[PDB]
Coordinates of N, CA and C in Angstrom, one line a residue:
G1 N 13.0 12.6 -15.0 CA 13.2 12.5 -13.6 C 12.2 11.6 -12.9
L2 N 12.6 10.9 -11.9 CA 11.7 10.0 -11.2 C 10.7 10.8 -10.3
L3 N 9.5 10.2 -10.2 CA 8.5 10.8 -9.4 C 9.0 10.8 -7.9
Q4 N 8.9 12.0 -7.2 CA 9.3 12.1 -5.9 C 8.2 11.8 -4.9
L5 N 8.4 11.0 -3.9 CA 7.4 10.8 -2.8 C 8.0 11.3 -1.6
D6 N 7.1 11.6 -0.6 CA 7.4 12.2 0.7 C 6.7 11.4 1.8
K7 N 6.9 11.9 3.0 CA 6.3 11.1 4.1 C 4.7 11.2 4.0
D8 N 4.2 12.2 3.4 CA 2.7 12.2 3.3 C 2.2 11.6 2.0
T9 N 3.0 11.4 1.0 CA 2.5 10.8 -0.2 C 3.0 9.3 -0.4
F10 N 3.9 8.8 0.4 CA 4.5 7.5 0.1 C 3.5 6.4 0.1
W11 N 2.8 6.2 1.3 CA 1.8 5.2 1.4 C 0.6 5.4 0.6
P12 N 0.0 6.6 0.4 CA -1.1 6.8 -0.6 C -0.7 6.4 -2.0
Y13 N 0.6 6.6 -2.4 CA 1.0 6.2 -3.7 C 1.0 4.7 -3.8
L14 N 1.5 4.0 -2.8 CA 1.6 2.5 -2.9 C 0.2 1.9 -2.8
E15 N -0.7 2.6 -2.1 CA -2.0 2.1 -1.9 C -2.7 2.1 -3.3
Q16 N -2.5 3.1 -4.1 CA -3.3 3.2 -5.3 C -2.6 2.5 -6.5
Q17 N -1.4 2.0 -6.4 CA -0.7 1.4 -7.5 C -1.1 -0.1 -7.6
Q18 N -2.1 -0.6 -7.0 CA -2.6 -2.0 -7.1 C -1.4 -2.9 -6.8
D19 N -1.1 -3.8 -7.8 CA 0.0 -4.8 -7.6 C 1.1 -4.6 -8.6
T20 N 1.1 -3.4 -9.4 CA 2.2 -3.1 -10.2 C 3.5 -3.0 -9.3
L21 N 4.6 -3.5 -9.9 CA 5.9 -3.4 -9.2 C 6.3 -1.9 -9.0
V22 N 6.7 -1.5 -7.8 CA 7.1 -0.2 -7.5 C 8.6 -0.3 -7.0
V23 N 9.5 0.4 -7.6 CA 10.9 0.4 -7.2 C 11.2 1.8 -6.6
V24 N 11.6 1.8 -5.4 CA 11.8 3.0 -4.6 C 13.3 3.2 -4.4
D25 N 13.8 4.4 -4.9 CA 15.2 4.8 -4.7 C 15.2 5.8 -3.5
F26 N 15.6 5.3 -2.3 CA 15.8 6.1 -1.1 C 17.2 6.7 -1.2
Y27 N 17.3 8.0 -1.3 CA 18.6 8.7 -1.5 C 18.8 9.8 -0.4
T28 N 19.9 10.5 -0.4 CA 20.1 11.7 0.4 C 20.9 12.7 -0.4
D29 N 20.9 13.9 0.1 CA 21.7 15.0 -0.5 C 23.2 14.9 -0.4
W30 N 23.6 14.1 0.6 CA 25.1 13.9 0.8 C 25.6 12.5 0.2
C31 N 24.7 11.8 -0.6 CA 25.1 10.5 -1.1 C 25.7 10.6 -2.5
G32 N 27.0 10.4 -2.5 CA 27.8 10.3 -3.7 C 27.3 9.2 -4.7
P33 N 27.3 8.0 -4.3 CA 26.8 6.9 -5.1 C 25.4 7.1 -5.7
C34 N 24.5 7.8 -5.0 CA 23.2 8.0 -5.5 C 23.2 8.8 -6.8
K35 N 24.1 9.9 -6.8 CA 24.3 10.7 -8.0 C 24.9 9.9 -9.1
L36 N 25.7 8.9 -8.8 CA 26.3 8.0 -9.8 C 25.3 7.1 -10.5
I37 N 24.4 6.5 -9.8 CA 23.4 5.6 -10.3 C 22.2 6.3 -10.9
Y38 N 22.0 7.6 -10.6 CA 20.7 8.2 -11.0 C 20.4 8.2 -12.5
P39 N 21.3 8.7 -13.3 CA 21.0 8.6 -14.8 C 20.7 7.2 -15.3
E40 N 21.4 6.2 -14.8 CA 21.0 4.8 -15.2 C 19.6 4.4 -14.7
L41 N 19.3 4.8 -13.5 CA 17.9 4.6 -13.0 C 16.9 5.3 -13.9
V42 N 17.1 6.6 -14.3 CA 16.1 7.2 -15.2 C 16.0 6.5 -16.5
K43 N 17.2 6.0 -17.0 CA 17.2 5.2 -18.2 C 16.4 4.0 -18.1
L44 N 16.6 3.2 -17.0 CA 15.9 2.0 -16.8 C 14.4 2.3 -16.7
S45 N 14.0 3.4 -16.1 CA 12.6 3.7 -15.9 C 11.9 4.0 -17.3
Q46 N 12.6 4.6 -18.2 CA 12.1 4.8 -19.5 C 12.0 3.6 -20.4
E47 N 12.8 2.6 -20.1 CA 12.8 1.3 -20.8 C 11.7 0.4 -20.2
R48 N 11.6 0.3 -18.8 CA 10.7 -0.6 -18.2 C 9.4 0.2 -17.7
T49 N 8.7 0.6 -18.7 CA 7.5 1.4 -18.5 C 6.4 0.5 -17.8
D50 N 6.6 -0.8 -17.7 CA 5.7 -1.7 -16.9 C 6.0 -1.7 -15.4
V51 N 7.0 -1.0 -15.0 CA 7.4 -0.9 -13.6 C 7.4 0.6 -13.2
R52 N 7.0 0.9 -11.9 CA 7.0 2.2 -11.4 C 8.4 2.5 -10.7
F53 N 9.0 3.6 -11.1 CA 10.2 4.1 -10.4 C 10.0 5.4 -9.8
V54 N 10.2 5.4 -8.5 CA 10.0 6.6 -7.6 C 11.2 6.8 -6.7
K55 N 11.3 8.0 -6.1 CA 12.5 8.3 -5.2 C 12.0 9.0 -4.0
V56 N 12.7 8.9 -2.9 CA 12.4 9.4 -1.6 C 13.7 10.0 -1.1
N57 N 13.7 11.3 -0.8 CA 14.8 12.0 -0.2 C 14.7 11.8 1.3
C58 N 15.6 10.9 1.9 CA 15.6 10.7 3.3 C 16.3 11.9 4.0
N59 N 15.5 12.8 4.5 CA 16.0 14.0 5.1 C 15.3 14.3 6.4
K60 N 15.5 15.4 7.0 CA 14.9 15.7 8.3 C 13.3 15.8 8.1
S61 N 12.9 16.4 7.0 CA 11.5 16.6 6.8 C 10.8 15.2 6.7
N62 N 11.4 14.2 6.1 CA 10.9 12.9 6.0 C 11.3 11.9 7.0
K63 N 11.9 12.4 8.1 CA 12.6 11.5 9.1 C 11.7 10.5 9.7
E64 N 10.4 10.7 9.8 CA 9.5 9.7 10.3 C 9.4 8.5 9.3
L65 N 9.4 8.9 8.0 CA 9.3 7.8 7.0 C 10.6 7.0 7.0
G66 N 11.8 7.6 7.1 CA 13.0 6.9 7.1 C 13.1 6.0 8.4
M67 N 12.6 6.5 9.5 CA 12.7 5.6 10.7 C 11.7 4.5 10.6
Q68 N 10.4 4.8 10.1 CA 9.4 3.8 10.0 C 9.9 2.7 9.0
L69 N 10.5 3.0 7.9 CA 11.0 2.1 7.0 C 12.4 1.5 7.3
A70 N 13.0 2.0 8.4 CA 14.3 1.4 8.8 C 15.4 1.6 7.8
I71 N 15.4 2.7 7.1 CA 16.4 3.0 6.1 C 17.8 3.1 6.8
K72 N 18.8 2.4 6.3 CA 20.1 2.4 6.9 C 21.2 2.9 6.0
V73 N 21.1 2.6 4.7 CA 22.2 2.8 3.7 C 21.7 3.7 2.6
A74 N 22.6 4.6 2.2 CA 22.3 5.5 1.1 C 23.1 5.1 -0.1
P75 N 22.6 4.7 -1.3 CA 21.1 4.5 -1.5 C 20.6 3.1 -1.0
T76 N 19.3 3.1 -0.7 CA 18.6 1.8 -0.5 C 17.5 1.7 -1.6
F77 N 17.2 0.5 -2.1 CA 16.1 0.2 -3.0 C 15.2 -0.8 -2.4
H78 N 13.9 -0.4 -2.4 CA 12.8 -1.3 -2.0 C 12.0 -1.6 -3.2
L79 N 11.5 -2.9 -3.3 CA 10.5 -3.2 -4.3 C 9.2 -3.5 -3.6
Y80 N 8.1 -3.0 -4.1 CA 6.8 -3.2 -3.5 C 5.8 -3.7 -4.5
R81 N 4.9 -4.5 -3.9 CA 3.6 -4.9 -4.6 C 2.5 -5.0 -3.6
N82 N 1.4 -4.5 -3.9 CA 0.2 -4.6 -3.0 C 0.6 -4.0 -1.6
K83 N 1.2 -2.8 -1.6 CA 1.6 -2.1 -0.4 C 2.6 -2.9 0.5
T84 N 3.3 -3.9 -0.1 CA 4.1 -4.7 0.7 C 5.5 -4.9 0.0
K85 N 6.5 -4.8 0.9 CA 7.9 -4.9 0.4 C 8.2 -6.3 0.0
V86 N 8.5 -6.5 -1.3 CA 8.8 -7.9 -1.8 C 10.3 -8.1 -1.9
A87 N 11.2 -7.0 -1.8 CA 12.6 -7.2 -1.8 C 13.3 -5.9 -1.4
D88 N 14.5 -6.0 -1.0 CA 15.3 -4.8 -0.9 C 16.8 -5.0 -1.2
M89 N 17.5 -4.0 -1.4 CA 19.0 -4.1 -1.5 C 19.5 -2.7 -1.2
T90 N 20.8 -2.7 -0.9 CA 21.5 -1.4 -0.6 C 22.6 -1.2 -1.5
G91 N 23.0 0.0 -1.7 CA 24.2 0.4 -2.5 C 23.9 0.7 -3.9
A92 N 24.8 1.4 -4.6 CA 24.6 1.8 -6.0 C 25.1 0.7 -6.9
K93 N 24.4 -0.5 -6.9 CA 24.8 -1.6 -7.7 C 23.7 -1.9 -8.7
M94 N 23.8 -1.2 -9.9 CA 22.8 -1.3 -10.9 C 22.6 -2.6 -11.5
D95 N 23.7 -3.4 -11.6 CA 23.6 -4.8 -12.0 C 22.7 -5.6 -11.1
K96 N 22.9 -5.6 -9.8 CA 22.1 -6.3 -8.8 C 20.7 -5.8 -8.8
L97 N 20.5 -4.5 -9.0 CA 19.1 -3.9 -9.0 C 18.3 -4.5 -10.2
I98 N 18.9 -4.5 -11.4 CA 18.3 -4.9 -12.6 C 17.9 -6.4 -12.4
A99 N 18.8 -7.2 -11.8 CA 18.6 -8.6 -11.6 C 17.4 -8.8 -10.6
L100 N 17.4 -8.0 -9.5 CA 16.4 -8.1 -8.6 C 15.0 -7.8 -9.2
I101 N 15.0 -6.7 -10.1 CA 13.8 -6.3 -10.7 C 13.3 -7.5 -11.7
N102 N 14.2 -8.0 -12.4 CA 13.8 -9.0 -13.4 C 13.3 -10.3 -12.7
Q103 N 13.8 -10.5 -11.5 CA 13.4 -11.7 -10.7 C 11.9 -11.5 -10.2
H104 N 11.5 -10.2 -10.1 CA 10.1 -10.0 -9.6 C 9.2 -9.6 -10.8
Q105 N 9.7 -8.9 -11.8 CA 8.9 -8.5 -12.9 C 9.7 -8.7 -14.2
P106 N 9.8 -9.9 -14.7 CA 10.6 -10.2 -15.9 C 10.0 -9.4 -17.1
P107 N 10.9 -9.0 -18.0 CA 10.4 -8.1 -19.1 C 9.8 -9.0 -20.2
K108 N 8.8 -8.4 -20.8 CA 8.2 -8.9 -22.0 C 7.6 -10.3 -21.8

């Protein structure tokens, strides 16, 4: 399972991850497609151990984080380096995600 971040741990996590690529899966409890893509995401995370995969439940508890990050679509994916968003995409499109990741952190 992917490491879960919250409104109080999100930015401290990105602060301490230096410039390693961080892939954030923003999901919700009502998001069908999120449940469809999740086992593939876990799979990818075990293969690409050079990239960080984490997840954020956009809910009322985390509502300030979702507003601050301007989350619109469930799921949304952000890629981060050095505390800074280098890409994003929406929807459960694992093909597109893998291509986005390889364009920022090519394997091997």
